[PDB]
Nucleic acid binder design. Structure first.
Ligand SMILES: [Ca+2]
Ligand SMILES: [Ca+2]
Ligand SMILES: [Ca+2]
Ligand SMILES: [Ca+2]
Ligand SMILES: [Ca+2]
Ligand SMILES: [Ca+2]
Ligand SMILES: [Ca+2]
Ligand SMILES: [Ca+2]
Ligand SMILES: [Ca+2]
Ligand SMILES: [Ca+2]
Length: 112
RNA sequence: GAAGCUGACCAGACAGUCGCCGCUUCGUCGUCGUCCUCUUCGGGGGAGACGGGCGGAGGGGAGGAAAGUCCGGGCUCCAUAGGGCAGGGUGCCAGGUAACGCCUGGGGGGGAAACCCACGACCAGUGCAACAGAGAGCAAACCGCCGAUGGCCCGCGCAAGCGGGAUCAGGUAAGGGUGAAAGGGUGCGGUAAGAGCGCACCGCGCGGCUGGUAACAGUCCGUGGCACGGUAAACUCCACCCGGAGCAAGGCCAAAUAGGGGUUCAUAAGGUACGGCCCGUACUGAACCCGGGUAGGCUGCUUGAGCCAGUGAGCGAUUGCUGGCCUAGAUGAAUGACUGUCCACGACAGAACCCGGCUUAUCGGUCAGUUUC
RNA sequence: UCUAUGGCUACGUAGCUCAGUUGGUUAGAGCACAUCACUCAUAAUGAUGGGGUCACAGGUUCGAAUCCCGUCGUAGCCACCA
């Protein structure tokens, strides 16, 4: 069947800027999420892991894949909105379970 | 034959859901400027080149360094006839890939032979912080003193010159000596007793040789007596190599736009390129900056100067011949969770034009060798 | 507020801006604040603290901020048409 639908990701910088316009922000001192309303009917997610926040590329790939998996899992529940995630300094030392729970809590908060 | 140090490998693997990436293939939607065959187009057997157009089947996806440009190479457009520097690299020499700031045989050095080497030169230019130049360099009270022990009545020759002492001062004393690394010594009539100045030894310098394709060895004869001790990643010299730039090089397919200003121009050929300067080459306006968007599709992107097994060569790096093989290559950018096990309990770390290296991080183990009870 | 992977470019000395180049002295002014007659909570062309590992890891040298290779960090450029 169809693989991952590219219509659920932020590809061009235009969409990134559109989301960064005036989104609703929510996050912990580690990671934050900014969500805006769109007109496609399905939600979208974006990733933003800078090199200064995380130097090791393996950790960047790990966090990106974890966020994508969490989004794919909680896709039918989240509201039709485009989200963008941003990491900070102090997230590489977090474990998989703790980071997954934090992302789940952030998504539950963004649900409103 | 209880414990180190090199060396190749693994460092996470096996099975089950919810998910990413692509390749081949089965059934379909279509374009075809190939049309085989029906081809009067309100169609149809269509064979195939193709496409986020689709529903299934198979086998696969972190590397051991994908981490850093620190090197060389395949390709590419930018663009060049030849002579010279400047600034860059290779440097014990020899062999192999196309080669290298790659690997290996041999020699040499380094106090661990106890296992390393960024190891050419200086008998043309420069320096070498002594604070007494005695680490380019000439001698300082300080002991020495050979030259008459220049002389200086202290004794006498108060009558030819002699004894002593030191005159410590007016003489080079380069011989040990204290002053951060110091012109070779072990011993000698070693002058009136200081220095190869003279005598036996040399790892000190020049030429010859018997080993050896060379690097350099040498306990071998035959002399001249000394004419650098370093740093040469300190200037400089030699044997070879130097246009450089990167796949966000560029090569195609369409899709919305050389239209705009100042830098100066008979045949002086004044501007450009080979250069960063110079002889030379033949070709015509030149870069500072002002105008527009796309974020589209294909390649380089995964078939390598590789892999398996045998026959050879090379005392080794490496390479002649056979049978054969390849399931990631992307584009905000693929690896996750719950369970049964492993003990190798799972550290570092991630691919992106590519290949062969170089530097470093690299929890713990597998073995094949090397020092000590 | 943005942003990897790849090529090239410039550096890392008082908290901030700034120059020095084995010259052996082993190193320098201003901006944050106090002190001398501190003249209106600027004093002026003055001095007194300077609580700088000259970012980290090495090397020929007697010795290195300076010379050669290395690690980390920050900052900048890389899609074309007529
Ligand atoms: Ca396997
Ligand atoms: Ca590789
Ligand atoms: Ca010389
Ligand atoms: Ca000489
Ligand atoms: Ca002597
Ligand atoms: Ca002499
Ligand atoms: Ca271009
Ligand atoms: Ca591609
Ligand atoms: Ca990408
Ligand atoms: Ca990488």
């Amino acid at each position: 069947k169809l693989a991952f639908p590219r219509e659920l990701r932020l590809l061009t910088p235009s969409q990134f800027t559109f989301v960064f316009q005036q989104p609703q922000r929510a996050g912990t001192p580690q990671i934050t999420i900014l969500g805006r309303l769109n007109s496609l009917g399905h939600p979208r997610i974006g990733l933003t892991v800078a090199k200064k926040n995380v130097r090791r590329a393996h950790e960047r790939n790990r966090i990106k894949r974890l966020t994508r998996e969490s989004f794919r899992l909680r896709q039918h529940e989240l509201p039709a909105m485009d989200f963008v995630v941003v990491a900070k300094k102090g997230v590489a030392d977090l474990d998989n379970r703790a980071l997954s729970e934090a992302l789940e809590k952030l998504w539950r908060r963004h649900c409103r």
